[PDB]
Design an enzyme around this catalytic site. Structure first.
Site, PDB file in Angstrom:
ATOM      1  N   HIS A  41       0.796  -1.232   0.000  1.00 32.95           N
ATOM      2  CA  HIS A  41       0.000   0.000   0.000  1.00 32.95           C
ATOM      3  C   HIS A  41       0.832   1.288   0.000  1.00 32.95           C
ATOM      4  O   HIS A  41       0.302   2.347  -0.346  1.00 32.95           O
ATOM      5  CB  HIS A  41      -1.061   0.009   1.130  1.00 32.95           C
ATOM      6  CG  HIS A  41      -0.543   0.479   2.458  1.00 32.95           C
ATOM      7  ND1 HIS A  41      -0.259  -0.387   3.489  1.00 32.95           N
ATOM      8  CD2 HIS A  41      -0.266   1.725   2.921  1.00 32.95           C
ATOM      9  CE1 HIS A  41       0.171   0.304   4.533  1.00 32.95           C
ATOM     10  NE2 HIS A  41       0.170   1.588   4.216  1.00 32.95           N
ATOM     11  N   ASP A  90      -0.696  -7.276   1.744  1.00 33.14           N
ATOM     12  CA  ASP A  90      -0.022  -5.993   1.860  1.00 33.14           C
ATOM     13  C   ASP A  90       1.483  -6.191   2.064  1.00 33.14           C
ATOM     14  O   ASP A  90       2.025  -6.016   3.174  1.00 33.14           O
ATOM     15  CB  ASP A  90      -0.634  -5.153   2.989  1.00 33.14           C
ATOM     16  CG  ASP A  90      -0.258  -3.680   2.896  1.00 33.14           C
ATOM     17  OD1 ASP A  90       0.381  -3.247   1.889  1.00 33.14           O
ATOM     18  OD2 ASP A  90      -0.604  -2.949   3.840  1.00 33.14           O
TER      19      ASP A  90
END
Ligand SMILES: [NH3+]C1CCCCC1
Ligand SMILES: [Ca+2]
Ligand SMILES: [Cl-]
Ligand SMILES: [Cl-]
Lengths: 250, 58
Positions: A41, A90
């Site tokens: 992210h 992530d």
């Protein structure tokens, strides 16, 4: 980092600072001389992939003491399953353009074998999380590297104790529900490091939460054990032109 | 022995083998000692050790 302490200079030597146009972007973890693990992210809004810098041996952002080593990031590898703007998968693997030089202030964290990580490390209660992120929710970021010891929860217990994304099998909870102690904005991508019999290992990546140090909620970390084979294969691969690489996962 | 219990006695990594057999292993930059379980650094800056603290107790 909220409610932690300054990591004494040199005691978090695997900590990476990622910069874009000189500005603080995220943390990361050095795992050998050319590879860094961070959070997918962190790269959702990157426009010029060629302005990304990794810094090792960093401690006090207000000064230069000569232990710092800066490198251009040659590759950002993100799993195919990660969807920008979301929380699952992530993780990012970064290839430095030139190796860092290992020194007293620059040392990799061990990337563990999966079995070892699942069977043993996953049951070590406390682990360290670090970064130059916000010292308080809606607060200023740190000038000195901070570190925080946080306990891990089994996911059933995390859900039970929490009071909105699911906690998937690619995640785990750690920290405190009383709003005193957490990783925070700007710490994303940084290490969750676990000590076992005299040696430290990468078990988590600072990923997300319901705000920072929010009462009734815990920090969420990417469960690195799910990605060991994926990372190990990529680290054996030749570099490809163009910084961003999406790689199949599993 | 078995790797799921007590890490098979290994300091680092553990493989179960066919029979009542177990092999411990060490990360790059370490070697396995003759006890078959302990790992010792073979380089100056092995992963997961903090030089200023290792010097502090050396
Ligand atoms: N505990 C998380 C809170 C949001 C930013 C990343 C860390
Ligand atoms: Ca500095
Ligand atoms: Cl290849
Ligand atoms: Cl490019």
């Amino acid at each position: 980092i909220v409610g932690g302490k300054v990591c004494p200079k040199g005691e978090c030597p695997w900590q990476v600072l990622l910069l874009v146009n000189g500005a603080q972007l995220c943390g990361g973890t050095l795992i050998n001389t050319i590879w860094v693990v961070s959070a997918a992210h962190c790269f959702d809004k990157i426009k010029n992939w060629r302005n990304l810098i990794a810094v090792l041996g960093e401690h006090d952002l207000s000064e230069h003491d000569g232990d710092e080593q800066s490198r251009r990031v040659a590759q950002v590898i993100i799993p195919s399953t990660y969807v920008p703007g979301t929380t699952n998968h992530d993780i990012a693997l970064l290839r430095l353009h030139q190796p860092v030089v290992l020194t007293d202030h620059v040392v990799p964290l061990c990337l563990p074998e999966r079995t070892f990580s699942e069977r043993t490390l996953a049951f070590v209660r406390f682990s360290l999380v670090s970064g130059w992120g916000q010292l308080l929710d809606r607060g200023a970021t740190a000038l000195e590297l901070m570190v925080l010891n946080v306990p891990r929860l089994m996911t059933q217990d995390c859900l039970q104790q929490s009071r909105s994304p699911n906690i998937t099998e690619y995640m785990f909870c750690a920290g405190y529900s009383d709003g005193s102690k957490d990783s925070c904005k700007g710490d994303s991508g940084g290490p969750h490091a676990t000590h076992y019999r005299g040696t430290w290992y990468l078990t988590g990546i600072v990923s997300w939460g319901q705000g920072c140090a929010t009462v009734g909620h815990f920090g969420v970390y990417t469960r690195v054990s799910q990605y060991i084979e994926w990372l190990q294969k990529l680290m054996r691969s030749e570099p490809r032109p163009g910084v961003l690489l999406r790689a199949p996962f599993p | 022995l078995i790797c799921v219990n007590e890490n098979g006695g290994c300091e680092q990594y553990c493989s179960d083998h066919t029979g009542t057999k177990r092999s411990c292993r060490c990360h790059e930059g370490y070697s396995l000692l003759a006890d078959g379980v302990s790992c010792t650094p073979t380089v100056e800056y092995p992963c997961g050790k903090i030089p200023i603290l290792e010097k502090r107790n050396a």
